Amino acid sequence: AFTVTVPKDLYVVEYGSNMTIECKFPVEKQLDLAALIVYWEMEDKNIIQFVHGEEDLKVQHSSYRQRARLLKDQLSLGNAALQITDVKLQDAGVYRCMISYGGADYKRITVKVNAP
Amino acid sequence: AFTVTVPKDLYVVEYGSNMTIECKFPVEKQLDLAALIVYWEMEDKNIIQFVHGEEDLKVQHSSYRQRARLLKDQLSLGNAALQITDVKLQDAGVYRCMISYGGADYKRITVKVNAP
Numbered sequence: 608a609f610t611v612t613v614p615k616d617l618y619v620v621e622y623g624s625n626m627t628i629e630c631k632f633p634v635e636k637q638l639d640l641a642a643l644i645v646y647w648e649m650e651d652k653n654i655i656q657f658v659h660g661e662e663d664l665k666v667q668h669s670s671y672r673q674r675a676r677l678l679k680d681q682l683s684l685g686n687a688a689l690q691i692t693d694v695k696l697q698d699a700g701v702y703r704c705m706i707s708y709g710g711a712d713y714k715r716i717t718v719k720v721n722a723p
Numbered sequence: 724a725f726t727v728t729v730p731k732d733l734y735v736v737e738y739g740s741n742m743t744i745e746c747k748f749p750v751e752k753q754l755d756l757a758a759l760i761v762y763w764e765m766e767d768k769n770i771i772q773f774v775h776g777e778e779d780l781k782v783q784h785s786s787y788r789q790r791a792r793l794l795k796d797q798l799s800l801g802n803a804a805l806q807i808t809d810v811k812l813q814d815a816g817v818y819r820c821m822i823s824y825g826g827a828d829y830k831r832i833t834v835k836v837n838a839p
């Protein structure tokens with residue numbers, strides 16, 4: 608069965624740092640962007656919404672504006688990595704990386720942000 | 724945006740009763756099974772896993788074996804209803820109906836089971 612795996616399910620990060628949460632799914636040979644959906648969420652906040660090759664950044668939650676991106680260079684290797692720059696306390700919570708790619712799976716990642 | 728809607732996000736049911744949890748998604752004309760993934764879970768228990776029409780009884784969580792199924796009579800109407808027979812206390816929790824169908828969405832539904 609199509610499996611999403613997270614190499615780390617717990618991130619403990621310093622205030623103001625840059626953080627990359629990895630999220631892996633299998634790709635045989637070539638990645639078919641047209642078949643891929645990548646969704647990143649935290650307490651119902653829309654962080655990343657990659658739908659069949661297209662990203663609507665208008666729907667991203669304001670609290671993540673200019674700080675959260677999906678690293679496309681990784682995607683091609685089956686890593687739907689979320690990078691957050693300038694991490695804030697408002698970023699702490701349970702993240703879910705959800706993938707649809709001929710099959711579907713998701714995993715949780717807890718991020719704890721240390722006090723300044 | 725592709726939207727999964729739930730006509731009810733809270734069910735309050737009697738112990739030992741039958742329960743249908745509705746979950747609706749848009750269907751334009753004919754249903755394309757090869758494009759449909761429906762998944763129902765609660766507390767990481769795999770309840771329904773319908774992948775392009777394919778289901779595997781072996782992956783269904785044992786506490787729901789023989790009691791839970793996906794209502795197929797109205798998948799063509801866009802209702803991926805989860806039916807549970809002989810509701811038990813351990814059926815109380817937060818359910819997710821996750822649907823991929825030319826796009827992807829999911830909704831949470833809370834079930835509270837009244838004591839007998």
Ligand SMILES: COc1nc(O[C@H]2CCc3c(-c4cccc(C(=O)Nc5ccc(CNC[C@@H]6CCC(=O)N6)cn5)c4C)cccc32)c(C)cc1CNC[C@@H]1CCC(=O)N1
Nearest residue numbers: 610646705706707711712713726762821822823827828829
């Ligand atoms: C979780 O185990 C599973 N899971 C499954 O299928 C699951 C996996 C994930 C997903 C998605 C999905 C995928 C990608 C993205 C999204 C998504 O885009 N979400 C989203 C998007 C937007 C919004 C906000 N709203 C926007 C609009 C506007 C207004 C409104 O109301 N909506 C909310 N949410 C979804 C949903 C879609 C169907 C189903 C599913 C399946 C087959 C099997 C399993 C079993 N695993 C076990 C395996 C073996 C061992 C192991 O480690 N793994």
